[PDB]
Amino acid sequence: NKKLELMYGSLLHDIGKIVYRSSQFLNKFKPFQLSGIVDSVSAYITYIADNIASGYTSSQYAALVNKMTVGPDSFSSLLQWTESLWSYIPSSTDTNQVMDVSLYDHSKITCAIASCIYDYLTEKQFYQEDVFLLVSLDMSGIQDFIYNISGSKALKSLRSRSFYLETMLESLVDDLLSDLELSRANLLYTGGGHAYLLLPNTERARDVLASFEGEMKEWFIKIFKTDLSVAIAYKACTGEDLMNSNGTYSDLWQTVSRKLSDKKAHKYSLNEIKLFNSTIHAGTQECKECLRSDIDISEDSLCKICEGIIAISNDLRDYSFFVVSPEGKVPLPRNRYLSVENQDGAERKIKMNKETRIYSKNQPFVGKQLVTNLWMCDYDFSTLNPETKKQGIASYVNREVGIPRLGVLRADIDNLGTTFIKGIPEQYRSISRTATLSRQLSMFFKFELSNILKGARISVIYSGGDDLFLIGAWDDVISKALVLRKAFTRFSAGKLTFSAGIGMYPVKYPISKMASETGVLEDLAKRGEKNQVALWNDSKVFGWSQLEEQILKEKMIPLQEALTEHGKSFLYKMLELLRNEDQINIARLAYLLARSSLSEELTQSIFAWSQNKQQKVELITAIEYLVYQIRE
Amino acid sequence: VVKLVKLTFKSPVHFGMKRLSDSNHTIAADTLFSALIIEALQQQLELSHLLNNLVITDLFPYNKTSYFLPKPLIRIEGYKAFKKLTYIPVENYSEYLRGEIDSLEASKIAESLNLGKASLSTKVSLQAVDHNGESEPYSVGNFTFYPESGLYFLAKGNADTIGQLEILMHALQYSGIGGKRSAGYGQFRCTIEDSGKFDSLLSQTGNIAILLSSAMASDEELVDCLEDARYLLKKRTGFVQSKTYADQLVKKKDFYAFSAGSTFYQKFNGKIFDVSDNGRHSVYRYAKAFWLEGKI
Amino acid sequence: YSKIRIVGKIDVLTGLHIGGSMIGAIASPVVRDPYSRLPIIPGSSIKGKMRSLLAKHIGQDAPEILRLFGSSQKGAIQSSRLQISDAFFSKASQEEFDKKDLAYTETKFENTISRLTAVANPRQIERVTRGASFDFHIIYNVENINEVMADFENIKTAIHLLENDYLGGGGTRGNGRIRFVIDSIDTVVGDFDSSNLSIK
Ligand SMILES: Nc1ncnc2c1ncn2[C@@H]1O[C@H](COP(=O)(O)NP(=O)(O)OP(=O)(O)O)[C@@H](O)[C@H]1O
Ligand SMILES: Nc1ncnc2c1ncn2[C@@H]1O[C@H](COP(=O)(O)NP(=O)(O)OP(=O)(O)O)[C@@H](O)[C@H]1O
Ligand SMILES: [Mg+2]
Ligand SMILES: [Mg+2]
Fold this sequence. Notes:
part of a larger assembly; 3 chains; A: alpha+beta; five-stranded mixed sheet; 15 strands; globular; B: alpha+beta; three-stranded antiparallel sheet; binds ligand ZAN; binds magnesium ion; rna binding protein; Type III-A CRISPR-Cas RNA-guided nuclease Endoribonuclease cyclic oligoadenylate synthetase HD nuclease; CRISPR system single-strand-specific deoxyribonuclease Cas10/Csm1 (subtype III-A); EC 3.1.-.-,2.7.7.-
């Protein structure tokens, strides 16, 4: 098993740098004493992989060394341990070159490159040879699948399908990694609904890719027909291209993307079309959710996939162990099924049958055997309280003071692909930089969101790589959207913005209508300048600076403090005067404010806000927000 | 003889695709052909010409400025604007085929098209109210066209077929088209006219072929047409609309056809696929192909 | 086969509110045309109201209604004879309301005094102003030539009931009163003679 020791050595070939800045440390442990690993730390494949990849407190370092102080199918646990520990440690301890690459990133990329190089060998002049394969897996019609929902259970499906979808993608990648004798490090990273992998450029890998593509096409045709159709596109790559030599790394990314698009253009093969147009029986009964008749339908007018999706919806928040096994609730490729169960159920599934995969959700522990950590933001305020868990979003609508409405948010990053392709300059562009950026984005959207929304009445419908769906209390939705904007701004250190749409609806308003209206709101918010928030009416679109400070802090707060003789009737009279929007109406507003017994400072502030044109709509929005918040 | 037909929609139209809530601004040629068959059977007309020699296209937008055509699916060498782009004016079609259109120009073309405004009408059913029940709300998607805009299509056939189609369109003006008819939707006025520009554009000899309708070929033509061709499958399905098929309303067999605008290097013909599932009569579905030559 | 086109004008006798968010604004806005922003009467609001009136009179399951307004029941699949179309704000009414600087719709303020706390709950219901005229357009499908006279007698009964009833909104509180004015009952499709037919 030379490949296993090679993987261990490549991952741990820089373990000595930690103790040096705090091989022999590896020799301290008998399981890690194996010849291949220690040889790599201090073979030639590890050196060539490190060359390909390359092209703060001492007490805390000692504490990390103390914390740190090899069988098959155990590499995943060590990889999780490396990801959990070496994230903050830079790969280059001290160099004039910027330390963008972290220790974990360098170790993972080196291990992937070493595995690919060893697979190539099994089958400077070495760099020029086409030795790698950049492959991309992209599922099609994802949001169409997510939003095709039967009303009576739509919310459940809305939470589950996306989760199901993401888990499905993970399984696919793992199966490919299972058919290539590779580890989880060999995948570069997985965006929302899109995965990117680095593979050896051998005949075995190409044949495996072709077989995987065909079998996944067959499975998606069988199960979801044309609703979901993953496409896999690979391009041959040389060592110099991976090292950004000759400036072709971005060229490789772009050519893989356009090859994937071309493959998407010609999707189905000839016999697949023939089988599509060969339905013997039409079928009378149809499902509520997917509106499909060919699959057998229960008495409740729900498809089998739909029923499993609803089951996984009620299960997902309760437990934290996704088991891919022959036993489960929802389908997964290669005749598998996805279930969500506790640790006892997880270990039962492990012991009963082999080849059962386990994914622990947001669990940083690595001592558990045969678990791969999946990141997912499932923050639900209703789940925190059992009665609210029973009630649902109607609990969010429940509110002592404030208009009982429900707010929906559909945030999305702006020009992310431009940042990935064009944002990173030519000099610094490397696959380690791209991997670090993608991992940071996934960690922010899937893990940091639960921290940001903590203490708020918001339920995360989905928190994919770019898109974000939230639904909860309207005031809480708006406040947490502003907090999310500022947190994202300080996390990205600028250079990244997201546009958002916040819509307010009644409790019993249909979920599909809410989603469509908030989607069109955020579509107007994107506009052309980007970095905008569309609040309430689609006519009004504001900026984050305006909404956080000009609308709420500058105008709404003084009005709240003054209102707390003054009553809601005065606010409604002022609203009528402002919304009339005529010069004589500003004169009448001046009269009313003169005889309103209001403070002269605030009176002049309101008059000045009414004089302007943008401040007019800002003051209108501020008073509307105050009226909404002050309802009984 | 190719004959332009323009429809001006006095009332909003449903033109649903998968649900009642959604509204499409256009419909495939299969829906139009089914409506023509229904109208001909209502008028006791002969179906020999419609089934044999009548090659129609999808419904395409037309504005006050210029007519529109589906965007051909060819490689583009940002791309999000191109993917969002759906319809190309007739004068810019050749430029797009050569690729002279850029991302900014593609976005400006997308903004240039002004068909109308889509919206949602919330209606109810009160039939259960008197029977100790409650009203049931539902939604209908309606796309109200701009006063200048409308929906045109091209129909090629013999003179007898052209006359029969003229009669059928004269009847359809009041029978309505699309979905949710008899509830205030689908009323339109027809205008059948000869178009020199479309005659010139269709009469070309290009290296590729672009589909102007939802079409599907037989087994052999499908065998010799899919080679290095970019397309997009549309799931044509739904229920059967007739009073002489079954005692209840049942769905027809699911069908799949290439979208209009798909580029096929080899030109394949189409047939009127039968989607009847053991019924009194044969529920037809239009899948003939209307081809436009193009240069890339 | 024939189609008979009944073209006419609905004259609004009380503020007609066919129904169909922002604070301090119209809580219940009328359905309006998307681009024109001209209030309209959906054909459904006329068809269903006439069906309800025929149910009150003839009586639903009645074969006359089941044939006129259409049905999809088991075995009895019947095409709807009456295809109503949306009633659009008439051009003459557009000119009249453009004169007198008059808005096309009014915002009638209302409230509701509770039986327990005696606290009013104000609403602002949009209603089309009295005197506004909507161009209405009905199509009758002649499926059975022998039944045309009976169907048109039923339609006249329905219109007679409707002119004494309301068309949309809360009519028991005064809204919705309308009056049909038939401008034509000419046949557009077929050769059936509709000259003898009358609606009012
Ligand atoms: N499981 C998920 N749940 C919610 N959103 C997702 C999920 N996976 C991916 N996404 C994002 O949701 C959107 C779904 O868009 P699509 O349905 O179009 N599927 P996509 O991967 O984009 O392929 P294309 O059809 O565009 O060629 C994507 O733009 C992604 O940004
Ligand atoms: N977590 C992630 N890590 C790395 N790449 C991602 C991630 N999420 C999304 N992506 C990629 O980032 C893109 C986000 O797509 P978007 O739907 O956000 N549209 P974008 O390309 O950003 O331009 P705009 O319309 O916003 O102006 C995807 O198409 C993927 O290519
Ligand atoms: Mg985005
Ligand atoms: Mg996005």
